[PDB]
Design a protein around this ligand. Structure first.
Ligand SMILES: *[C@@H]1O[C@H](CO)[C@@H](O[C@@H]2O[C@H](CO)[C@@H](O)[C@H](O)[C@H]2NC(C)=O)[C@H](O)[C@H]1NC(C)=O
Ligand SMILES: *[C@@H]1O[C@H](CO)[C@@H](O[C@@H]2O[C@H](CO)[C@@H](O)[C@H](O)[C@H]2NC(C)=O)[C@H](O)[C@H]1NC(C)=O
Ligand SMILES: *[C@@H]1O[C@H](CO)[C@@H](O[C@@H]2O[C@H](CO)[C@@H](O)[C@H](O)[C@H]2NC(C)=O)[C@H](O)[C@H]1NC(C)=O
Ligand SMILES: *[C@@H]1O[C@H](CO)[C@@H](O[C@@H]2O[C@H](CO)[C@@H](O)[C@H](O)[C@H]2NC(C)=O)[C@H](O)[C@H]1NC(C)=O
Ligand SMILES: *[C@@H]1O[C@H](CO)[C@@H](O[C@@H]2O[C@H](CO)[C@@H](O)[C@H](O)[C@H]2NC(C)=O)[C@H](O)[C@H]1NC(C)=O
Ligand SMILES: *[C@@H]1O[C@H](CO)[C@@H](O)[C@H](O)[C@H]1NC(C)=O
Ligand SMILES: *[C@@H]1O[C@H](CO)[C@@H](O)[C@H](O)[C@H]1NC(C)=O
Ligand SMILES: *[C@@H]1O[C@H](CO)[C@@H](O)[C@H](O)[C@H]1NC(C)=O
Ligand SMILES: *[C@@H]1O[C@H](CO)[C@@H](O)[C@H](O)[C@H]1NC(C)=O
Ligand SMILES: *[C@@H]1O[C@H](CO)[C@@H](O)[C@H](O)[C@H]1NC(C)=O
Ligand SMILES: *[C@@H]1O[C@H](CO)[C@@H](O)[C@H](O)[C@H]1NC(C)=O
Ligand SMILES: *[C@@H]1O[C@H](CO)[C@@H](O)[C@H](O)[C@H]1NC(C)=O
Ligand SMILES: *[C@@H]1O[C@H](CO)[C@@H](O)[C@H](O)[C@H]1NC(C)=O
Ligand SMILES: *[C@@H]1O[C@H](CO)[C@@H](O)[C@H](O)[C@H]1NC(C)=O
Ligand SMILES: *[C@@H]1O[C@H](CO)[C@@H](O)[C@H](O)[C@H]1NC(C)=O
Ligand SMILES: CN1CCC[C@H]1c1cccnc1
Ligand SMILES: CN1CCC[C@H]1c1cccnc1
Ligand SMILES: CN1CCC[C@H]1c1cccnc1
Ligand SMILES: CN1CCC[C@H]1c1cccnc1
Ligand SMILES: CN1CCC[C@H]1c1cccnc1
Lengths: 208, 124, 208, 208, 208, 208, 124, 124, 124, 124
């Protein structure tokens, strides 16, 4: 059995608290993307938007690598939560009581050390709905994601276009697009800049 | 297979061959791996060779890499170790140990306690 | 006592992170089935369906085997959560806030290494209810289940017919049938196909 | 100090995953009983009944025994959850989202190895309420309890009469009785029969 | 550093499952008291009372003691949950779904081995509200606390007067007093008597 | 790799239960501050205020220090919950059922041993709303934070001005200011004074 | 039973039989298993034989499989080890160890510290 | 009591009595138990006798059960070991070890490192 | 301080004094404690003396309590051990070991591996 | 790289230089660190020198700090140890051990079992 040998070899000397970088003097690049599937509800009185979304995070470990010729039949491995390093990506404008509303799943790694992480969830965010132009109006709701404890010089966050291939049309609202933008801000807490990624919903009310 | 016992030791002359047999009893022999260790008169126990539970993986030491061989036989519940071109420094006690669904590696933490082995001596 | 000996022998060298396959080059076959017991509620305003369901997963381990003649009186063992490998079957179209709403129970294994897993739960899923034909209409609600991190070439998912022997008739809706279908899809995240199983509810409103 | 010595001696070689039987070829006998304290609510629209109930489970371990003469002053011990074997008794017709709604407490054992377990809880179950005879009618609500993974030949479940000594009368419903019955059923999942215990509420509406 | 030495010395040979008594043949005395801060809500339809309360439990360990002269600068220590023995005091007439609604905090111990435990919480209990004398009426709501697994001969529970110094007056109800009483009862489950402490709210409706 | 070496060196002999002080005879100074981002809701009937807030706690460890010249490329480390000492700051006037409603995140430490902790959350607190001057009125809601088990002589709590740079204006209420004040009180439980920090909201209703 | 003490050693001639008795004290003898170990003059401790707490399971070594036997007696709180056809290599110190509700296996992690044993010597 | 030191050794004749004293320092003597161990010239360390922190529980070996006795004295922070009818095999080094709130058992995992002991020799 | 090296050994006469120096390198010397151990020719390693990272706590053995002393010097990153009135039984190899933020206790689990020590011999 | 084997030993005269080669096989040599240990005739195993998996970190003992050097070669999957100005006390058996993504430190818990080493002897 080669899977047992591979797992035992990989687990050796691994520390989940260490950022999987090879130089320690350069930031680790992480690619972030979104996949919306359904706008479950749009609350006007409470200014809350509910949607079903899958997150997509991609990076490289450099510590989980092996030669496939020495472990025939093994090309990918999966690790549960709390056993390998994972980015702490959070939604800034969260309206849920728990704040974080993501279901943790396994992380998949291939021979080259490339790690992918796609947690599904139902996210509630605070959005401002304008009803001045009731019959005809376009609403813009923003979702802001970013690392909470990792800033610049440590984690370089890059954006990828959102996927709407599996989107399920809503009976009362029509989606126009989900543009994304990457920004970098300064906070009074620290002098280190922090990047973030913001996506726009761009909903439109149906006149019926 | 739960309880492994080694046999086949004796006195041989330098440059000869020897075949040792480790027989299993007390369980299913196909669910365990077999590992060989040498005790030596005044030295510590050292790994020699190992084979996985399915026979698809094998491991050997560095001073035994080219002269020894290991094979399985589920019909007789027996593992066979063939030693060729014996040398004076190979005189020691050989013991056989099981490992449930082992990978045939040199790690000592996946094996159970070795049994009573067989003494072999090589005369120049 | 033979139960202690059997448990101690089985636990040796076992790794929950390893797929219990004997070749590593062939997929592990898992049989999946459903057992509905009651349609607790059908929400039209929120487009949500609530039901009581038992899942059924069957597979083989090849690592949990013993000769019954050497352990007289012992023919089955039970393992709690987190101590043996288990499929990560999830409902894609989940509407619950927790996403996963299954109560974890023990896994039962017999001498041959066959593992069964039947978690009960109350599942909430998003369904579209059409009220155009209010007095007379048939509603189709789909429940989609699949592995989240295990795709083709690793886990071969097979379907079994749903059981409705213990179904409790509802006072407002009548069940017509629960057909099931197995499909295979491609996702933009990975080039490996992923199978899934979809069941249909086929409810009908009672004219009273 | 004798309590430390007794605990240390008892903990040796104990495995929580092993059924505390002395032969392994005979079922372990478990006595089950209920204690209702208050019918907090009766929901007609949702067909749900809420009550406050204490469960009572009694059995024998055969592994937790000692001579009181060698440990003077010690006659009982208490073990928390997850450290000793416990029956997996569950309510089949549960309506709560969590399914299981029991608060885990300590298990008390005396010198002879007799274990008692009395978890309190607030249980929600699905009941059918008939309002055809609105002013005068008797409602029968059934609560079904049973082992989920332990069937016949392993766990012999016996019933004991319910206790209503501490019952608090309700201002709108009157209790007539709580009869209990033990039954044995066959399920398509396995060929091994499974026992269960069912209790009836027998409520009556007050005419005011 | 003396704090590290003190902690390391104290942790040795300590067993959280052992009652911290010096004789094993005498009950351990525990003092219990309450501190109400606000009557957040009084529900008449559901017969539920919500309040903010701090519990106060005081006892002695006899295992956590040291000479302050050998550890200069150290006079108190704090232990988290699950690392030292704690009484299992619970509210019998609980209406919350979780049953237990107390936030676990640290336990403080001084040189003599005296342990104090003051958990805050928001408690929901079932109370009967009589509206026959609507404009003028006094409502009595009882809160009953007691040990669940420790009875007489093991834990001697004593009562202390409730503290209302920090009480915040309510805009619709006026508090008259919170008398307390200690009682001892027998239950059909066991022949060992169990003590309990009951407090009364004594609310009055404001005529406006 | 220097990050692994630094983590392994730091973890040695560390005890999370010890207050990271160098003398044991002087209090540890902790700076506390608040950052409000949005007044999500103001409930008048239930006397509850909901807001989105980030807490800011700053202190020094004296046990997590290293020479940056011996670990080139490493200038900061991050520790998860439960692995290092953290202040037990809680909100006294909490109205949430869980009482504590803070999402735990990592703690960041730089070469000098300075630790920062900024948990985000949605806090519910009990506030009194006066509607006598309905069209025109200013409401004062107080939020009180303090250590629960650490009093004077152990933890010296200092206050810092609140940050409102990222505040999002509300459509129905206008913020005037968030003054803060540090106080010290005595409780009947202990003779040791306890400090606390109170912030005021100072909301005003918009006349539209 | 908490504290086990072995006795019955002595000097015997090759080919004779010997009966060793391990007596229990300090607890209930029916709640523990009994295991036998040999120390040997210059070698390490080695398992010899073991019996479960109920007497339904027994285990023996490989060089002792056919010549030794083990029995229980709860009335006298005594375990008996019968050795037949003794050989010169059986001269060593025999020690008796308890195991709470043991399965009578060779694993050393389920036993407690052995007591003071009895010396036996076999003369050719 | 944190740091225990044994004394009272010497040369005695077979059949005589001897009293050894273990004095405590560095902490509260009433919060710890006292255990005695023998080193022997060429053998391993072995338990001899032990007393609980309150003096209500005592434990002895099997070859010392009837000849030795153990007592406490909190006034002088001293544990006393009385040996009667000494035998030639009792010549060894005796060491004293503490145990915080110990139960006076033979388990070695509840004791701390032993200190520098006292040598005693018995002449036939 | 990460890597500690001891020096100052030599040959001395009974009743004389000796000063041993343990120098630190590879890290901050003020973040670690220093402990001294003796190897002895045919005995096991034994603790001798220890000092906390701040110098406010010290610990000594029982046979060295009154004759030895320990001091720190952060300027030179050196710990000094002064031995007075040496005795013939003090001839051994002395080794120096670090402990990160240690309390200067005798516990061996809070120290790191000792380095190469210095041999000292006392002649009567 | 999974399996490391050392070679290059022999007999040399005091004051000469020697080059030892540790070759890797069974895996990727760039994913592991290399550590050197000395066995000595009658002493215990001791660390000598170590190099990280990337070659950016090195560690040496105190008696070898100035005379030995360590280098890597991924092309030949070989680590080289150069010893200059050999001394009589350097006669021992040198063994090579791997460490997956090691930091090149002296800690023994991050290394795997050493292989069969090479004997080197220095004559005055
Ligand atoms: C493991 O996966 C990675 C990434 O999928 C493969 O490396 C390349 O990664 C970039 C993005 O970082 C892709 O655009 C390339 O297509 C990837 N190369 C491919 C797919 O050949 C890496 O090759 C994979 N390792 C394997 C297949 O053994
Ligand atoms: C353990 O259970 C398995 C499966 O129930 C038995 O193997 C066969 O499995 C197939 C399905 O994979 C069934 O259709 C067969 O009926 C099973 N054989 C039977 C029931 O004889 C296996 O035999 C069982 N092991 C036992 C009973 O020892
Ligand atoms: C420990 O408790 C058990 C059960 O309470 C006692 O054994 C008997 O158990 C049956 C039910 O299984 C009761 O009807 C008997 O009354 C019990 N015997 C009694 C109460 O004497 C057992 O005796 C108890 N052990 C003690 C008291 O040491
Ligand atoms: C530790 O606290 C206890 C209790 O507070 C002190 O012992 C006495 O306890 C009783 C109640 O059990 C109080 O009424 C006394 O006032 C306490 N004695 C005092 C306060 O002197 C004990 O003295 C405290 N230990 C100290 C201060 O070292
Ligand atoms: C680590 O951070 C601390 C605090 O940020 C720096 O020490 C000083 O801390 C005070 C507040 O306690 C600040 O007002 C000073 O500005 C800080 N000094 C600076 C920023 O130079 C400490 O210098 C930092 N360590 C580094 C940068 O290596
Ligand atoms: C790490 O990055 C720095 C600059 O960011 C560079 O100078 C250095 O060479 C890099 N490390 C290595 C091993 O090349
Ligand atoms: C993997 O191993 C094979 C067999 O030794 C070898 O030919 C190949 O080069 C190795 N792969 C890499 C990337 O070194
Ligand atoms: C594993 O499967 C492959 C093809 O899927 C096959 O060639 C190989 O023989 C199988 N393994 C064994 C041990 O037969
Ligand atoms: C189980 O053990 C018995 C007894 O040795 C044997 O006859 C039988 O063949 C074994 N079963 C298998 C499948 O080998
Ligand atoms: C276990 O039960 C079987 C029948 O159920 C019986 O034949 C056997 O004797 C029992 N075990 C013992 C040790 O008596
Ligand atoms: C318990 O111990 C006492 C004292 O040795 C003994 O008399 C009694 O018989 C024992 N109890 C049992 C059930 O053996
Ligand atoms: C324990 O209490 C009993 C009576 O409750 C008493 O006889 C006994 O003496 C007490 N223990 C001690 C050590 O005094
Ligand atoms: C604490 O230690 C000091 C110093 O040895 C001593 O004087 C005092 O009596 C001790 N306290 C107690 C309660 O024994
Ligand atoms: C600790 O503080 C006290 C007074 O608070 C002071 O006397 C003492 O010197 C301080 N400790 C040190 C090591 O200076
Ligand atoms: C850090 O190390 C460098 C190099 O040895 C040294 O020059 C510097 O003084 C050190 N820093 C401190 C604060 O001692
Ligand atoms: C960038 N983060 C998001 C807001 C707070 C800030 C932060 C900074 C340092 C540690 N934790 C959080
Ligand atoms: C097939 N899965 C279901 C949707 C996401 C996808 C996936 C792929 C790889 C890792 N995790 C999830
Ligand atoms: C008897 N149980 C109740 C319903 C499912 C069934 C069962 C059978 C085997 C394993 N788990 C559950
Ligand atoms: C006194 N307790 C409160 C009600 C149940 C009873 C009890 C008795 C024994 C074990 N657990 C609970
Ligand atoms: C100061 N705290 C806040 C209220 C209770 C008090 C307290 C005192 C001691 C231990 N825990 C809590």
């Amino acid at each position: 059995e080669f899977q047992r040998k591979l797992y035992k070899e990989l687990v050796k000397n691994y520390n989940p608290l260490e950022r999987p970088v090879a130089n320690d003097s350069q930031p680790l690049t992480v690619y972030f993307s979104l996949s919306l599937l359904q706008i479950m509800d749009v609350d006007e009185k409470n200014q809350v938007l509910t949607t079903n979304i899958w997150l997509q995070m991609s990076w490289t470990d450099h510590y989980l690598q092996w030669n496939v010729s020495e472990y025939p039949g093994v090309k990918t491995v999966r690790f549960p939560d709390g056993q390998i390093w994972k980015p702490d990506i959070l939604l800034y404008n969260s309206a849920d009581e728990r704040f974080d509303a993501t279901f943790h799943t396994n992380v998949l790694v291939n021979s080259s050390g490339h790690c992918q992480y796609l947690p599904p969830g139902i996210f509630k965010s605070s959005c401002y709905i304008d009803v001045r132009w009731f019959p005809f109006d376009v609403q813009h709701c923003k979702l802001k994601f970013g690392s909470w404890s990792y800033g610049g010089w440590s984690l370089d966050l890059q954006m990828q276009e959102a996927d709407i291939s599996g989107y399920i049309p809503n009976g009362e609202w029509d989606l126009v697009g989900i543009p994304g933008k990457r920004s970098e801000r300064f906070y009074e807490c620290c002098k280190e800049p922090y990047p973030d990624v913001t996506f726009t919903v761009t909903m439109r009310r149906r006149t019926l | 297979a739960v309880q492994l016992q080694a046999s086949g030791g004796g006195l041989v002359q330098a440059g000869d061959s020897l075949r040792l047999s480790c027989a299993a009893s007390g369980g299913t022999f196909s669910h365990y791996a077999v590992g060989w260790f040498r005790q030596a008169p005044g030295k510590e126990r050292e790994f020699v060779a190992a084979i996985s539970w399915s026979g698809r993986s094998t491991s050997f030491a560095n001073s035994v890499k080219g002269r020894f061989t290991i094979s399985r036989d589920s019909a007789k519940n027996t593992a066979y170790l063939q030693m060729n071109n014996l040398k004076p420094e190979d005189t020691a006690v050989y013991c056989c140990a099981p490992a449930r669904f082992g990978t045939g590696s040199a790690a000592r933490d996946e094996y159970d306690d070795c049994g009573q082995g067989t003494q072999v001596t090589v005369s120049s």
